[PDB]
Amino acid sequence: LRHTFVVADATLPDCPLVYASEGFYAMTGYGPDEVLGHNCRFLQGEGTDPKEVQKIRDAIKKGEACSVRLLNYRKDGTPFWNLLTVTPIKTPDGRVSKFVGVQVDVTS
Numbered sequence: 001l002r003h004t005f006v007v008a009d010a011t012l013p014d015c016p017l018v019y020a021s022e023g024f025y026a027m028t029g030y031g032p033d034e035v036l037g038h039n040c041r042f043l044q045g046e047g048t049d050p051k052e053v054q055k056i057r058d059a060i061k062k063g064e065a066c067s068v069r070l071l072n073y074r075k076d077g078t079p080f081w082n083l084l085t086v087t088p089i090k091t092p093d094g095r096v097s098k099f100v101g102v103q104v105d106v107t108s
């Protein structure tokens with residue numbers, strides 16, 4: 001199946017994205033200059049369910065994995081359904097260093 005992949009830096013307080021696969025840029029319409037250094041939430045918009053957003057916010061704050069389905073918007077404004085799985089990456093001392101995300105466009 002077609003998916004995309006990003007890495008977020010958890011050592012920075014607001015989990016900016018530091019790496020994205022070619023598919024992530026191609027799927028969203030945004031280039032590296034608009035994606036790198038930014039929190040993934042710029043993909044959100046009017047129809048995004050705040051309850052699902054809250055699930056990821058809590059899991060990130062708690063350093064747990066999380067899988068949620070979100071309405072997202074491309075650079076051109078058009079919406080798509082993003083099945084998103086975030087995974088915490090810990091150092092051996094228990095601290096979370098990075099979050100990794102798999103994003104699937106599940107508009108089908």
Ligand SMILES: *[C@@]12=NC3=[C]C([C])=C([C])[C]=C3N([C][C]([O])[C]([O])[C]([O])[C]OP([O])([O])=O)C1=NC(=O)[N]C2=O
Pocket residue numbers: 006007008015039040041042043044053054056057060070072082084086087099100101103
């Ligand atoms: C986004 N993918 C994504 C990938 C990773 C690795 C992480 C850590 C987060 C995301 N987000 C969410 C965003 O960064 C944030 O966690 C949430 O919006 C909730 O926190 P706030 O503070 O905003 O309430 C992704 N969000 C998207 O909308 N699309 C993704 O692809």
